[PDB]
Amino acid sequence: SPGIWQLDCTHLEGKVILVAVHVASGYIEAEVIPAETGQETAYFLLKLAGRWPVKTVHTDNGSNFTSTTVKAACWWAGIKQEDGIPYNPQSQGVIESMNKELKKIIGQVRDQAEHLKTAVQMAVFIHNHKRGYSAGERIVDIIATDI
Amino acid sequence: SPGIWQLDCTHLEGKVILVAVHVASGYIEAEVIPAETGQETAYFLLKLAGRWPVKTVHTDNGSNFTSTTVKAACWWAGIKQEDGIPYNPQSQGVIESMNKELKKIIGQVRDQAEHLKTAVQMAVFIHNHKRGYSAGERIVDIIATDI
Ligand SMILES: COc1ccc(CNC(=O)c2cc3ccccc3cc2CN(C)Cc2cccc(OC)c2C(=O)O)cc1
Ligand SMILES: COc1ccc(CNC(=O)c2cc3ccccc3cc2CN(C)Cc2cccc(OC)c2C(=O)O)cc1
Fold it and tell me: How far from the centroid of its chain's Cα atoms is residue A98's Cα?
């Protein structure tokens, strides 16, 4: 579980927000892309795995699970690519609630920047710092304990 | 020192590679941009500070130190913006050696992707994983100990 991440795709302003959640901590990384493609998802995972010790990724949908480009990136980066079927039924709700919360924060910062990507990174900041520990503190502690 | 980062700008293929180094560990994050502007640097720092507990940034040059946009991002993200004058003379050499090493790795992966940004993220991955601890292990341990 220190190495388990979940992909999540949500939409705002006609754009796509791609999110990776570290399941055990709730820590997130996110980016804005014009549309979800295999190449964009692959590049996002490459970035993620260079920054955190990503062992397993639960993909957000069947297209990214199938994508040969995503599979290639996971091979390159030493990631076990898995499906994202909510075997635990709590998972749907948790991701739903995360997207709602993220969109709420984005709304609270949206008039502080021209570009959606800026607002999204502000929201990532606020989410990861929110406390009692923050998600950023939890991920570091979990991984440090594992090392 | 757990919160101290150094900015670094290097050039390849007519593009700019912007690098943030966590000084105590050698862990890096990096991105490719067409040129180093205040807005790009500001956005890069916002991303960084949402992902790690960035307390202090030593800026890479006087233009980024002066930039009101960079100062605004540092204000927003709770970062102390400082100059990057190598008071310790070993600092020049260490950054010089880091850029040379990064360019070497980029060369070793360059034919595995069309786009420079992909090669740069491959290089970030290799750098942070290289072992005896890796930079990625060191940064997590340093920060966890601090928390
Ligand atoms: C991350 O560094 C900062 C630094 C300062 C601020 C404070 N906010 C403003 O100064 C502002 C507020 C606006 C509010 C409504 C409409 C337009 C706006 C345009 C602006 C000016 N721009 C240049 C900010 C900006 C900078 C760098 C990259 C950016 O995007 C890549 C953007 C952006 O605008 O997204 C936000 C973020
Ligand atoms: C990170 O995910 C992967 C997945 C697979 C590979 C294996 N490499 C190739 O398949 C390849 C090698 C090339 C070698 C010389 C010239 C062109 C090339 C074009 C390609 C095909 N592209 C689509 C890879 C690619 C994918 C996603 C985003 C990308 O950039 C944003 C690029 C890119 O090309 O930069 C690398 C990285």
Answer: 10
Q: How many domains does chain A fold into?
A: 1
Quote the domain boundaries for residue B99. Answer: 1-147
Classify A56 as helix, strand or coil. strand
3-state secondary structure (DSSP) of residue A117: helix
Please name the amino acid found at residue A114.
E
Q: How many Cβ atoms from other residues are within 10 Å of residue A138's Cβ?
A: 17
Instruction: Using alpha carbons only, give the angle A127, A34, A4 rounded to the nearest 5 degrees.
Output: 45
Q: What is the spatial distance between Cα A46 and Cα B41, in angstroms, rounded to a whole number? A: 22
CA distance A6 to chain B (A): 17
Q: In sequence order, what are the beta bridge partners of A9?
A: A18
Question: How would you list the strands of the sheet with A27-33, edge to edge?
Answer: A27-33, A15-22, A4-12, A56-58, A80-82
Protein residue with least CA distance to atom 22, ligand 2: B113
Candidate of B108, B114, B125 to mutate for ligand 2, largest count of ligand atoms within 8 Å of Cβ: B114
Other Cβ atoms within 10 Å of B34 Cβ, number: 9
If you write DSSP's letter for every residue of B12-59 in order, what string do you get?
ETTEEEEEEEETTTTEEEEEEESS--HHHHHHHHHHHHHHS---EEE-
Kindly report the CATH number assigned to the domain that includes residue A66: 3.30.420.10
**Per-residue tokens: A34:** 């014009």
The pair of structure tokens assigned to B145 is: 């100990």
Residues forming a β-bridge with A16: A11, A33
Round to whole Å and give the CA distance between B125 and B129: 6
CA of A39: which chain B residue's CA is closest? B118
